[PDB]
Structures are given as structure tokens and as C-alpha cells.
């Protein structure tokens, strides 16, 4: 669940903390993440940092009880995804369809005990199934309305038709949307097609995509994504038992706004590869290149390596070290548009950065203790500074801690803590939570957060599971009310599903 410079989420870990509107409410207790209100990786900005659905780009996300795990990756193992990928990468993963009929529903609501702050009620369903021995489908949505404190709706759904060419090969055919009103409104919507197969020497994963997206004003804007991708991992013996992986993109984006010659585009073009080979058993070396070519900004050599030496049974030793970078985008880079104001600027360099990190792993015994130590030396951070411009930033440097500790105190007993520190060019967060299986259906949770000056914040929550079919979970957040942050709140949920 916690390794360097990688962490995971699990559904249990989801369904036993509801978040009250977006995943970054969870994912923001994973070491080296903070929300600046958006996901942060390592001090970098969210700007670098990337977020994946199904391992397919994306620019709640996803229902959160819709899924099934969510995986981040930081740093130095995480150049390999290109721009916006230099803090790291959030990779969110669905659930699928399945030999056998599945639903689920959700509702959850959150109620500020302060009349000042707005409530919120969402509301989400999964279905899944097969229709033919050939054909399944998974379909899911959600709607979700949070009241104006003195509101704002989403509806999303997801459609996915899932086709079994023959038992080595996959086609999933998908298509979705979400909207969102409260004026400012948005509408987007997303088709995409990918082709999996196992083959004799590996496995292969086409991707097309489509991504639309409207904006509406208190004039319109459109913006529009055209994707191809190809990956192979091919397993080899030679010399050493290895596994390459062979990677190309293609990508379009197109930006139309009448607010600023309307229309904007750009292409990228990469290969990477890396390989991951077994100099030992308990010896991992992997390196990886990784070319992207931007229609705008020239080449980018983006080279990693890292690795992994076990030292017994019961510790770990990994590092690595990469360049990664974070390309402007078509606002940045065009003097035409301006927003308020601000004007693109033809001349901006990509930001740089190269990452490094060193970390220590202990394991046994259900008792697990990580400590991962990072630096990130980056250059041309793209900043706002009337008529002001998109710029490059001067040099800067990055460091932490990144720590993880989690103590069976019992059977069915556990305390887990998870710990950021960092300076740039000095704060930390602390997160942790007491968990008590008091029985196979009921279950408890005493929550802290800790900044750092510092201060706290603290939630109870408890769950019980009747069945299959129902389960039920209530919560206080922020207990003491700790204000100068939302207030405390009372949240209740109810899932009920029939797998
Ligand atoms: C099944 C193909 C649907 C394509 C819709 C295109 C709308 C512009």
C-alpha cells in the first residue's frame, strides 16, 4: 500500500472514508501530496502533476465509489508520462465489466454543523454485466449538488462495451460526459477505443481518444483532445531476465475563444522506453529515454533511471533520478489570448526539472516503516507576476521527507501515519488514522491531519455492513471544530448493491 515514491488506494480504503465531493480529499493524505484546491505531488505545482483514468489523460473525476483503486506515482518514476508529469502522476482505476450481473447505488450527504457552510448530497450508481459470451458492459454516473454557503451541481456518466475477440484480445469501446452548472457552465464530453492483446512475445495497448469540452459565461470557449497511443512489453531473457517496454504517442489539441485568428493548435509526437531488468534477485535496474516533440517547443529528452536492492528478507533500498519537464499550454504560449488581465508569451521555455530520490523500506510482520528522502533541482516554473505576461522562473530547489508508518496494535487493531515534510527555496503535513475492526461488520476510524504554528484537525467514523446488498457508514469530521478550513460536519452514507 505505501513503497517509495508510490502509493495505493484501495475501494476499502474509499468506502471507509467517504469523501464529501472530489478524490483529492483522500488522495491528499498520501506522502508527498498536498492540495494547493488541487492535487500537489512533491512541492511541484499541479500544474505537473497528471491525472490518468484507466491510464488514458483526462484534461469528482470519478465516482468515488465507483473506484476500484487509485495509484500514485511520484517523481523520478513517473517521467516516463511526459508533460505535467514532473510532481508525478494520480492514476485512477475504474472497476469492469464481469461474467456476472453487478449494481450498485450510493448515496451519501454531508451536513456542516454551521448553517454558513453549504451541505452536499451525492448520489452515484455502477451497473455491470454481461450481455453475450462475447459482450459486457459497465455503466456508471453521478449527480451531486452542494449548496452556496453564505449552489453548484455535476451530472456525469460513463459508458463502456467491452468485446472479447478471442480469449487473447480485448476492444473497449467508451463514451461519457460530464456537465456542470450552478452563470459558469461547463459540458464535456469523451470517446475513446482500446485495443488490448496478449500475444506470444507480450502484450500490446492501442488507445484512441476524443475529449471534447464547452465553457459558458456569466461568450463560449471550446477545446478539443485527439489521442492515439501504442505500448508493448515484451519479456526477454537475454543477458538478464528483463522486460522492455516500448511506448509512442500522438496527440492534437485544438482551442477555440472568441475572447482575445480564434482557433489554437498543437501537436506532440514521443517514443519511451524503458526496460526493466533483473541484474540479481533481489536487484532491480531500469532504465528509460523518453523523446517528446512539440509542435511548438522543439524536443525533450526526458532519460531516468532507478532501482531497487533488497537487503534481506525484510528491507528495501530504492532510488532513482530523471529529467522530467511541463510544456506551456495554447494560453501560455499565445500572446493573442488574454485572461482576466494576462497575455500568452510566444517565447516561454519549458520548465525543467530533475528529480532525485533515495528511500528505505522495512516490512514484517504487518508492521511496515518507510522513509523516502527527495530533491527536485527545477528551472523555467511558468508564473503570473495592468497587463501582465506568462514568465519563466528563476532556478529553484526542492527536498523532503516522504515517511509511512503503519503498526498492527492488534488483531484487529492498526495506527497508520503518514508523514510530508518539505523546504523550497519549511512545512509538514502529518496523516493518520486508528483503525478498529471491532467486527466483521463493524468498523472504526479516529482520523487526525497535523500541519506545521501547527495545528490539527480531527474526524470519527464508523461502518456496518448488513450483506452483499447493504452497508451503511456515519462520521464526524473535524471533531473540535477547529476553525482559523471547513467546521465540523456530520456525514452519513448508504450503499446498497447487488453483485
Ligand atoms: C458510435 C459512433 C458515434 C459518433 C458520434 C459523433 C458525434 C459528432
Not at 522495512?362 to 501582465?388: C, E, H, M, Q, S
Request: glycine share 8%.
Amino acid at each position: 500500500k505505501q513503497a517509495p515514491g508510490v502509493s495505493i488506494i484501495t475501494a476499502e480504503d474509499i468506502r471507509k472514508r467517504p469523501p464529501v465531493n472530489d478524490l483529492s480529499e483522500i488522495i491528499r493524505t498520501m506522502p508527498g501530496v498536498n492540495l494547493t484546491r488541487q492535487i500537489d505531488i512533491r512541492g511541484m505545482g499541479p500544474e505537473n502533476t497528471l491525472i490518468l483514468v484507466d491510464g488514458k489523460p483526462v484534461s469528482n473525476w470519478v465516482p468515488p465509489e465507483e473506484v476500484e483503486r487509485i495509484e500514485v506515482l511520484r517523481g523520478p518514476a513517473a517521467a516516463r508520462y511526459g508533460s505535467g508529469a514532473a510532481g508525478g502522476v494520480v492514476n485512477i482505476i475504474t472497476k469492469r465489466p464481469t461474467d456476472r450481473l453487478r449494481g450498485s447505488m450510493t448515496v451519501f450527504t454531508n451536513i456542516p454543523e454551521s448553517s454558513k457552510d453549504g451541505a452536499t448530497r451525492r448520489a452515484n450508481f455502477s451497473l455491470s454485466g454481461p450481455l453475450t459470451e462475447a459482450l459486457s458492459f459497465r455503466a456508471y454516473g453521478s449527480a451531486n449538488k452542494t449548496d452556496s454557503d453564505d449552489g453548484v451541481r455535476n451530472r456525469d456518466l460513463s459508458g463502456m462495451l467491452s468485446w472479447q475477440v478471442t480469449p487473447d484480445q480485448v476492444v473497449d469501446f467508451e463514451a461519457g460526459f460530464s456537465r456542470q452548472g450552478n452563470t459558469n457552465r461547463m459540458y464535456r464530453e469523451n470517446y475513446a477505443i482500446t485495443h488490448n492483446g496478449t500475444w506470444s512475445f507480450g502484450t500490446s495497448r492501442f488507445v484512441a481518444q476524443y475529449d471534447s469540452t464547452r465553457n459558458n459565461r456569466l461568450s463560449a470557449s471550446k477545446l478539443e483532445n485527439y489521442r492515439l497511443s501504442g505500448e508493448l512489453n515484451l519479456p526477454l531473457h537475454a543477458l538478464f531476465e528483463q522486460v522492455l517496454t516500448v511506448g509512442a504517442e500522438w496527440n492534437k489539441e485544438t482551442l477555440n475563444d472568441p475572447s482575445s485568428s480564434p482557433k489554437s493548435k498543437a501537436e506532440i509526437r514521443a517514443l519511451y522506453v524503458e526496460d526493466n531488468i533483473e541484474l540479481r534477485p533481489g536487484t532491480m535496474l531500469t532504465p528509460g529515454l523518453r523523446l517528446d516533440d512539440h509542435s511548438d517547443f522543439g524536443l525533450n529528452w526526458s532519460p531516468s533511471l532507478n532501482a531497487s536492492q533488497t537487503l534481506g528478507e525484510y528491507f528495501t533500498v530504492k532510488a532513482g533520478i530523471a529529467r522530467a519537464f511541463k510544456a506551456p499550454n495554447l494560453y501560455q504560449s499565445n500572446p493573442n489570448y488574454l485572461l482576466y488581465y494576462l497575455v500568452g508569451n510566444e517565447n516561454l521555455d519549458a520548465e525543467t526539472s530533475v528529480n532525485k530520490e533515495l528511500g528505505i523500506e522495512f516490512r514484517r510482520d504487518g508492521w511496515v516503516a518507510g522513509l523516502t528522502y527527495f530533491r527536485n533541482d527545477y528551472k523555467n516554473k511558468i508564473v503570473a507576476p495592468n497587463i501582465l505576461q506568462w514568465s519563466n522562473a528563476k532556478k529553484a530547489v526542492v527536498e523532503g521527507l516522504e515517511g509511512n508508518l503503519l503498526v498492527p496494535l492488534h488483531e484487529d487493531l492498526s495506527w497508520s501515519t503518514n508523514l510530508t515534510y518539505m523546504l523550497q527555496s519549511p512545512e509538514y503535513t502529518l496523516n493518520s488514522t486508528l483503525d478498529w475492526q471491532a467486527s466483521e461488520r463493524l468498523s472504526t476510524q479516529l482520523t487526525s491531519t497535523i500541519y506545521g504554528g501547527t495545528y490539527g484537525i480531527w474526524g470519527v467514523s464508523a461502518g456496518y455492513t448488513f450483506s452483499e446488498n447493504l452497508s451503511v457508514r456515519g462520521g464526524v469530521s473535524n471533531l473540535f471544530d477547529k476553525r482559523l478550513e471547513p467546521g465540523r460536519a456530520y456525514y452519513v452514507s448508504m450503499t446498497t448493491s447487488f453483485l
